From Swiss-Prot, chains A, D:
SMART domains: Tryp_SPc
Protein name as it appears in the record: Serine protease 1
Gene3D superfamilies attached to this UniProt entry: Trypsin-like serine proteases (2.40.10.10)
PANTHER family to which the protein is assigned, alphabetical: RIKEN CDNA 2210010C04 GENE, TRYPSIN-RELATED
Alphabetical list of InterPro entries matching this protein: Peptidase_S1_PA (IPR009003), Peptidase_S1_PA_chymotrypsin (IPR043504), Peptidase_S1A (IPR001314), Serine_Proteases_S1 (IPR050127), Trypsin_dom (IPR001254), TRYPSIN_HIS (IPR018114), TRYPSIN_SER (IPR033116)
Subunit (UniProt): Interacts with SERPINA1.
Binding site for Ca(2+): E52, N54, V57, E62
Tissue: Synthesized in the acinar cells of the pancreas.
Family statement: Belongs to the peptidase S1 family.
Length: 223, 183, 182, 223
């Protein structure tokens, strides 16, 4: 996250980290046993970390739960970047509390101009790289379809939305992938892709979660 | 006399200097290119893309056609060589080149065991061009001009899955890359 | 109780003290053990051997089964832990452990992410013995006695090639080491 | 070399050295463009020095020539001791003179009890470390296969021989790796390995060059 702030202690308790001995992607807790993330974050053997203080340091208060299954969206395509969503079932249910809680799924899509909260442990620099030890947060508006499509000609699908500032300075970045975009208490987006970090006219691109609520609910019901 | 290729700092690329080749699109667009291998083939090594935008891959050096110009320029034939840090597992080179046609996939893959220099029909498969790709970065193009009388493929290079990995091949949709000074 | 393991100065090894584990055979026998990485897996780190007999690698410390005894003794289960000076890139432990069987190589590798203490079936994979290896030095042996009712592998540790690197695995032909004060 | 003597300049004109630091090794010039050394000394971008005696002083008789090819014996693995031989092709031919000359390959193997000359810039101390400024030399007998095999049970192959003294005191040592063992004017050995330096019952072990003459000639011929 570039141009953001350190999140309040308990203010993002649905944020999880996907782990293979190190943090490589973010995710969102949607129920005690299920996590939403990006399809491009898939790898076998995922450990999910919840309630994290310093992601670079194992500590108490944190719960480490092995993923028991990772269900990539079946239409996910590496060339079109489309359908970049994935569901992770936790081997054991997680303990909810002040630092671990789920986030509601949307019941309708969000409109351009809505302010949302974007979070993650990704890079904080527009030039070069710096990975924070603490969760960073950014408030950003969803951009119009036209602004998104003009920034990324021929690349924006119905399953994607842009959020951030065309002026640059505030944006998601490498490491934030799979993380949450919450608008009015609803998980409306997942950090999917971008080009550069917080550059002019290159805003972050997010999976449009509202298009997948049916697939999510049907997937959870049959697993 | 073509315009230079620029790294992510806006500086002109220097022949002989080490750069990471990283996807211009992060997240779902992956990370950098690296030396890899196939399940059923140890040597030569292949060109693969790291899945994670945290992983910049293996640095490369560029060699110009004319050893006298030290600037890497757009739309000019070049050799591309991975400069690994690890032990050398193979006797083949780490220079990029286009493979023979793969009947199992319909792809012309980017592989290694290429040659540096000696622009000729003998080295045709080892020459690549770098060209602007929108405002996002650059793309690789295989269209060698080093042999005016040779019939040659002339195609942008994209990324495609194979053998559980992400590889590069000739294709109609180029994948965009940026160049980062190595460490 | 059992005879102490000695360092290259003839002093008894102590738990908590850092030592380089260096091949008892120099030259083509290589140098010291170190934390390493596979090309296709970043974590956990693996145990590798440096090729240069002047490179003593990464120091380890030993933890005894009984924490009241600070003398490292032969043929006694203990934990082994790398103590890197460099910046830890992984969140897994640097404690040695026998990995799950590797179908791609037929080897039981020494890897890391082991556990210190609590001798038990849960930690069985983290317990190694140091044994005399001829007159050249010492060898590592994996044959834990911490769980008498557990089925366990029971084998010396040798050195073998993997991923263009030198690793350690269970095998018939042990590789000998000496311990140098770090 | 432990327990040896200062060779003197010009007395070992086939001795070369390769690389530096953790990668320093000896070798032997076998014609104007080729060097034999140990396979375990292999590294990319090898630099060869010829005509050196005092290696830490600009003497004026020395050539620095890079390797254009380095051929490790194809049966060699870094994780085994056997077949410890390598051939290095110089980028340009060495100028031969009083300080730089080739050593002859053997036409037959040497017998046990033969006296050979072993040379290198390796450690000179049986306990502790001290590297020489000038080339050191040692006269030592080839040991019987039974002495060699009994000192290193299970590890002496037919491509190795021991030389030195069961009493210790005189031995090759770390940093001598790759250098020559010369008997009756023939390159019979290559400093390959050992346990400790100059210790009782632990003589030096050397690659048996006579078993490799066919591969050497063919490799030079086709490269």
């Amino acid at each position: 996250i570039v141009g953001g702030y350190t999140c309040g202690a308990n203010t993002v308790p649905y944020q999880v980290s996907l782990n293979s001995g190190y943090h490589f992607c973010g995710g969102s807790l949607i129920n005690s046993q299920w996590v939403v993330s990006a399809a491009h974050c898939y790898k076998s053997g995922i450990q999910v970390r919840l309630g994290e203080d310093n992601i670079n340091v194992v500590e108490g208060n944190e719960q480490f739960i092995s993923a028991s299954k990772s269900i990539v969206h079946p239409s996910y395509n590496s060339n079109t970047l489309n359908n970049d969503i994935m569901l992770i079932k936790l081997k054991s249910a997680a303990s909810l509390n002040s630092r671990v809680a789920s986030i509601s799924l949307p019941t309708s899509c969000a409109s351009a101009g809505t302010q949302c909260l974007i979070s993650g442990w990704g890079n904080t620099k527009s030039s070069g790289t710096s990975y924070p030890d603490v969760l960073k947060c950014l408030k950003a508006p969803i951009l119009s379809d036209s602004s998104c499509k003009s920034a990324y000609p021929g690349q924006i699908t119905s399953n994607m939305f842009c959020a951030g500032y065309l002026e640059g300075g505030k944006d998601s970045c490498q490491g934030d992938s799979g993380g949450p975009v919450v608008c009015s208490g609803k998980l409306q987006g997942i950090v999917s892709w971008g080009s550069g970090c917080a550059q002019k006219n290159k805003p972050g691109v997010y999976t449009k979660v509202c298009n997948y609520v049916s697939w999510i609910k049907q997937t959870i019901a049959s697993n | 006399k073509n315009e230079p290729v620029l790294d992510t700092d806006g500086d002109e690329l220097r022949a002989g200097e080490q750069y990471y080749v990283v996807s211009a699109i992060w997240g779902a667009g992956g990370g950098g290119l690296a030396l890899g291998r196939l399940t059923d083939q140890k040597c030569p090594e292949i060109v693969v893309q790291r899945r994670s935008d945290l992983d910049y891959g293996t640095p490369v050096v560029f060699y110009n056609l004319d050893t006298k110009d030290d600037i890497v320029r757009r739309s000019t034939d070049l050799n591309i060589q991975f400069v690994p840090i690890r032990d050398r597992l193979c006797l083949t080179s780490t220079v990029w080149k286009i493979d023979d046609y793969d009947t199992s996939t319909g792809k012309w893959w980017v592989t290694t065991d290429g040659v540096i220099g000696n622009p000729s029909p003998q080295t045709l498969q080892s020459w690549f061009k770098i060209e602007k790709s929108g405002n996002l970065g650059y793309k690789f193009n295989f269209c060698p001009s080093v042999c005016e009388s040779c019939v040659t493929l002339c195609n942008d290079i994209g990324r495609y899955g194979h053998d559980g990995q992400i590889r590069l091949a000739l294709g109609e949709n180029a994948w965009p890359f940026v160049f980062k000074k190595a460490s």
